[PDB]
DNA sequence: CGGGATGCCCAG
DNA sequence: GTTCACCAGGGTGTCGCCCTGGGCATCCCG
RNA sequence: GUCUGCCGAAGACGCCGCACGGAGCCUGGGCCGGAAUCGUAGAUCGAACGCGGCAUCGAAGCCCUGCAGCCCUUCGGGGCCAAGGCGGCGCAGCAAGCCUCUUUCAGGCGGCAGAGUCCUUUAGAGUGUGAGAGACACUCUAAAGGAAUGAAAGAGGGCGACACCCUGGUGAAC
């Protein structure tokens, strides 16, 4: 009989193999008919649709193809031809809110108001002593705009003059420049790419060296003595030679642009944006990090992913599709063989198939192209942005008069009466005869302007007098400021509906720079200098969780924490998916669009509702992190140490509820603005980042609960779950004020739990925390209560207690060190830490013969317990 | 003569 | 019930740089 | 403008009044069907598979599309030509949008008479200044037309890049 199988088994692989071959050819057939029928003059329904058919069966063709020549036991039984492809969520699911008006937050009238500025004292740092261009400084800009009131009459004079600093409408200059330059655009970025990139012989190396050695500089006389292979080696001489390529290579690029400006640019504004364009992609291409193999040697890998010259995005182009018709029916012209193969003629090199199925969609494209967004407009109407960046150019001066709300914005044209030096005076408090930069007469300026009056609103009263302390003299130097630049954006008139010109305005202050720090804040052996460790741990739906640390005491002194929107979030995608379905299916399906255009209202509700959720309730709740730390624990005394998550770390659905860098950009601008140092390299003294391996899953109580023990006590008692598997078996709401257990559904992703659940199809609260907490068995006293089973305590909290304690293990370590040193040592220093703060906890309480069948939350305080 | 404009230069 | 490979439409987060001016030479026209 | 006297329903919410196409190329939409194929002899039993044929509801995308309607416009018209469906009966704070970017919360928005306040324009009149031009400074008085946001956070602009997620049109691996 097993000879017979053998002999059979060679009889259904070639026999299916042959059923292959005649489907393939029926998909051939079919292929041939409708490209020939595509053929067929004024045809343009096989034009899209039947295309869409014809990439169809070439996909089906050579996915047919590859399966037979790629596996020779081709024996297909999976049942997927014979698959129905259902679609698993149901018709009408539909599940709104029913929350509405329980309360609704007040809010209290405060009278906020710019009282006037005096002259600043000699209490300003030399180095920030001119405020010039790149003299010190923070250049902190403004978060809300600010409404200018334009004159009824002259506006269109105030028009034309901010039209010299109008930033869009320069890429079409680029662009062109391009064009007539290079012939076409991907030409251009290719050859301007090469032209950019430096080059590792060393003869144009040593070259840039000896310009830079007759340009006045001493330093780098041996550097031209130097071995070549050295030398190139050398990162000191690199940057040297890449400082010097990019001061030749944007000259005499910046000049080819230049050449080709139209008359009415202003060159000097044009000139300073692309000569930053063009420094920023020369420092791009040929900026290299230190990535070190296995064997030490460094390799020269460029940090940006692919960048590309400026202003030279690849712009979606209107195809028609008489010529993705001839190019489909020409590629079909040729041996189906040859039909997947690799275009010569594409960048890419992509298959015939692609480019083809790529031009498709550029053909369908064109029909549906800048349309359809879920209308979120910068005011509707037609603006144009720019930048102010002098004082002869634009400035916010102060009314002497006025005793409060006394702020214009003065702007110089060649109309209007001349400035009064003795009524407005600078918002830094100096008068206008200090600096000569707008004042007429005296010291060779001649200068008027008309100092428009500023209408200020809860916005920016709100960030002025939280950010701006320029009334006080003896105020600390991160709140005084002087302003020089101003981003500005005109919305422009319409007389369609007759409204009005409205100017909005966002000043950019240079705040005074002190030179306030914490020491050894980024030393790596160091622990920084303070009495105060906050340790950040970024999670998932727990935005952020705080734990001060006290070395004094050694002890945490407070837990605060945000609760996060992770389940609004699933809700709000769960509606969006089922209502962007609804929509789609009923699209396609035609002789019904009042359907079309409610679920289009209903998707613009949802839409509103995704809106809700951001990042700003979580900088929010930064900032007042940051403001208590100032406030209790006191300047000079903190470090907000964090995690060294990943940079691109990649989460599930998610990702609108991520807010995972936001956090570190918020702590590193907060703590930025209260007057701390900002280092070069992007670090702010106070926010340390300490990396974070299995070690932030220690217990407090001295368990690091490595993996392979937690799988193996697990894979041995499913039933009793560790580490941070505990919270996935339990139900995130509560019955009878605590969460039951439950039993998980047996299918990968479609985790559904069982709270001994016999009614028919219900769902109850079927999902679970997940990773969210961590049961310690071993701790079954914590901070003077008892746990019969173990305390069940938050994950993220494990993770704050571990960073803000971790780096006094650093220190006591050394840098030289791995994860299992840093783990050993904190599972010995972790018990000598307590607690002095309520530390939210969970307890195993009796449901059903069991303890560990509930899980009931209380605060667990210290300060009602301990003390 | 002089108010205002336009454009270039300041480079471990 | 999944996973991958394309093409549309919609939405997010995140990342590399640079910027956040004054002096001054010449034009320039009423 | 704004505040008060007085008047009302947009747009939503329940009810029904109605909708231009197949030659040819995809699919339901109904049938019928065995073979090339498979349940590891035969595989003719069953499973189906890509399909073949018949008739047909008729639609996906086009030829037919009128500018029914919206956008652009040099104002003549052109583009998509479908949409927005539209169009009544009862319900009249209860949508969207706006009052500033990124958000949240509270609040307001729609006809005609009355009242004050501010700004802008202007007038008479008056005061001093004014090598004196009845010019200027500016006051008094009067008239014309314009004038809802609080509260809590934010480093925001560019330029070029990535990497997720959702829904359709598909194909392949399980």
């Known amino acids: 009989m097993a000879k017979a199988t053998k002999e059979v088994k060679s009889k259904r692989v070639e026999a299916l193999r042959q059923v292959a071959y005649q489907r393939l050819e029926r998909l051939e057939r079919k292929a041939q008919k409708i490209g020939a029928h595509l053929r067929k003059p004024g045809k343009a329904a096989d034009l899209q649709s039947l295309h869409y058919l014809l990439h169809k069966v070439e996909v089906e063709y050579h996915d047919i193809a590859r399966n037979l020549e790629k596996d020779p036991t081709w024996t297909p039984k999976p049942k997927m031809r014979r698959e129905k492809r259902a679609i698993v969520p149901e018709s009408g699911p539909a599940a709104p809110l029913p929350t509405t008006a329980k309360g609704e937050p007040g809010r209290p009238a405060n009278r906020h108001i710019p009282p006037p500025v005096p002259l600043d004292s000699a209490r300003i740092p030399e180095d920030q002593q001119s405020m010039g261009q790149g003299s010190g400084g923070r250049s902190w800009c403004s978060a809300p705009f600010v409404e200018v009131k334009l004159p009824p009459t002259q506006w269109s004079n105030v028009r034309e003059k901010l039209l010299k600093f109008r930033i869009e409408d320069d890429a079409d200059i680029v662009r062109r420049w391009a064009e007539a330059k290079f012939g076409s655009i991907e030409t251009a970025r290719d050859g301007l790419r090469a032209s950019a990139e430096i080059g590792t012989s060393p003869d144009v190396w040593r070259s840039f060296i000896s310009r830079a050695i007759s340009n006045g500089k001493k330093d780098f006389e041996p550097l031209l003595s130097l071995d070549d292979d050295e030398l190139t080696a050398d990162a000191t001489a690199e940057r040297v030679v890449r400082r010097w390529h990019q001061i030749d290579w944007v000259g005499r690029m910046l000049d080819s642009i230049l050449e080709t400006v139209p008359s009415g640019v202003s060159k000097d504004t044009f000139r300073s944006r692309v000569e930053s364009r063009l420094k920023t992609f020369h420092s791009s291409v040929n900026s290299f990090e230190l990535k070190k193999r296995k064997d030490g040697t460094v390799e020269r890998k460029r940090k940006h992913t692919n960048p ?498 971790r780096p006094l293990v650093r220190e006591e370590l050394g840098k030289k060190a791995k994860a299992v040193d840093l783990a050993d040592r904190h599972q010995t220093l972790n018990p000598t830490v307590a607690l002095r703060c309520g530390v939210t906890a969970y307890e195993f309480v009796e449901v059903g013969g069991d303890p560990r069948g509930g899980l009931r939350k209380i605060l667990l305080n210290p300060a009602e317990a301990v003390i």
Not at 724 to 749: F, M, P, Q, T
Request: hydrophobic fraction near 35%.
């Open 308 to 805: 590309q010259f400026p202003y030279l995005s690849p712009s979606a182009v209107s195809i028609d599709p008489d010529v993705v018709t001839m190019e489909a029916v020409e590629l079909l012209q040729m041996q189906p063989e040859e039909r997947f193969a690799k275009d010569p003629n594409d960048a890419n090199g992509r298959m015939r198939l692609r480019v083809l199925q790529a031009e498709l969609g550029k053909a369908r494209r064109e029909a549906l192209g800048r349309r359809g967004e879920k209308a979120p407009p910068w005011s509707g109407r037609k603006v144009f942005r720019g930048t102010t960046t002098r004082k002869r150019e634009a400035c916010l001066v102060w009314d002497k008069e006025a005793q409060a709300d006394g702020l214009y914005f003065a702007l110089v044209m060649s109309g209007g009466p001349k400035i009064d030096d003795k009524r407005f005076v600078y918002m830094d408090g100096q008068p206008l005869q200090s600096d000569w930069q707008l004042h007429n007469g005296v010291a060779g300026k001649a200068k008027s302007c008309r100092a428009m009056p500023l209408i200020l609103k809860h916005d920016f009263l709100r960030w002025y007098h939280r950010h701006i302390k320029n009334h006080d003299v003896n105020a600390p130097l991160e709140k005084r400021c002087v302003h020089t630049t101003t981003q500005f954006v005109f919305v422009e008139p319409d007389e369609k509906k007759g409204l009005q010109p409205r100017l909005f305005i966002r000043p950019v202050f240079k705040f005074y720079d002190p030179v306030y720090e914490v020491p050894d804040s980024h030393s790596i052996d160091k622990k920084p200098d303070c009495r105060y460790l906050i340790g950040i741990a970024r999670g998932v739906n727990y935005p952020y969780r705080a734990a001060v640390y006290d070395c004094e005491t050694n002890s945490i002194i407070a837990d605060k924490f945000v609760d996060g929107r992770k389940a609004d979030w699933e809700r709000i995608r769960n509606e969006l998916a089922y209502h962007q379905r609804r929509r789609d299916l009923l699209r396609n399906s035609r002789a019904s669009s009042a359907a079309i255009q409610r679920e289009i209202r209903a998707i613009a509700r949802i839409r509103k509702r995704e809106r809700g959720l951001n990042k700003v309730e979580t900088v929010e709740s930064i900032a007042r992190l940051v403001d208590w730390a100032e406030e209790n624990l006191g300047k000079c005394n903190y470090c907000f140490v964090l995690a060294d998550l990943s940079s691109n770390l990649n989460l599930g659905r998610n990702n609108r509820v991520k807010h995972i860098a936001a956090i570190k950009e918020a702590l590193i601008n907060q703590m930025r603005k209260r007057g701390y140092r900002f280092k070069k390299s992007g670090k702010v003294d106070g926010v340390r980042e300490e990396s974070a391996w299995y070690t932030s899953a220690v217990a407090p109580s001295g368990w690091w609960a490595k993996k392979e023990e937690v799988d193996g006590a697990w894979k041995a008692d499913k039933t009793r779950p560790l580490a941070r598997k505990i919270g996935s078996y339990y139900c995130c709401e509560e019955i009878d004020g605590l969460h039951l257990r439950g039993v998980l559904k047996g299918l990968g992703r479609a985790k559904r739990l069982v709270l001994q659940s016999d009614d028919p199809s219900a769902p109850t609260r079927r999902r679970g925390f997940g990773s969210e907490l961590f049961w310690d068995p071993y701790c079954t006293e914590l901070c003077g209560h008892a746990f019969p089973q173990g305390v069940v305590l938050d994950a993220d909290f494990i993770g704050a207690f571990n960073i803000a304690l």
